Structures are given as structure tokens and as C-alpha cells.
Amino acid sequence: WLRRIKAWLRRIKA
């Protein structure tokens, strides 16, 4: 859930 790895792929200021 909204994990850092998910934001990593999104490259949205992970």
C-alpha cells in the first residue's frame, strides 16, 4: 500500500 517501491517505479519523488 503506497509502498516506497511502488513510488520507486512511478519515480514520483520516492
Short mmCIF file of C-alpha atoms in Angstrom, two decimals:
data_model
loop_
_atom_site.label_atom_id
_atom_site.label_comp_id
_atom_site.label_asym_id
_atom_site.label_seq_id
_atom_site.Cartn_x
_atom_site.Cartn_y
_atom_site.Cartn_z
CA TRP A 1 0.00 0.00 0.00
CA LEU A 2 1.62 3.24 -1.25
CA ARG A 3 4.93 1.46 -0.60
CA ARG A 4 8.25 3.17 -1.36
CA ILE A 5 8.95 0.52 -4.02
CA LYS A 6 5.68 1.42 -5.77
CA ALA A 7 6.59 5.08 -5.72
CA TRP A 8 10.05 3.98 -6.92
CA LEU A 9 8.68 2.74 -10.25
CA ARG A 10 6.48 5.81 -10.51
CA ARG A 11 9.64 7.86 -9.85
CA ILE A 12 7.44 10.43 -8.05
CA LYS A 13 9.95 11.75 -5.51
CA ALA A 14 10.26 8.28 -3.97
#
